[PDB]
Amino acid sequence: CRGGDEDALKAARAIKFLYQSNPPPNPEGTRQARRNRRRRWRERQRQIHSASERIASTYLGGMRM
Numbered sequence: 279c280r281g282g283d284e285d286a287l288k289a290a291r292a293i294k295f296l297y298q299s300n301p302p303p304n305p306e307g308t309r310q311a312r313r314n315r316r317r318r319w320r321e322r323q324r325q326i327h328s329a330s331e332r333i334a335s336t337y338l339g340g341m342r343m
Contacts, residue, residue: 279333279334279342279343280343281329281332281333282328282329282331283328
């Protein structure tokens with residue numbers, strides 16, 4: 279869980295550049311790979327393309343992205 283916002287992308291990109299550039303030793307660990315390459319829609323409404331919520335601290339089944 280990082281955050282959905284215009285400014286958020288700016289910060290995330292800063293670190294992302296390092297992540298993509300010369301990544302860590304993961305020969306048998308493409309977890310993030312599949313995590314990024316995927317499409318899923320579990321919403322029954324489209325009002326705004328931006329998660330207003332900042333941080334979600336809930337343990338109702340699932341980990342913290």
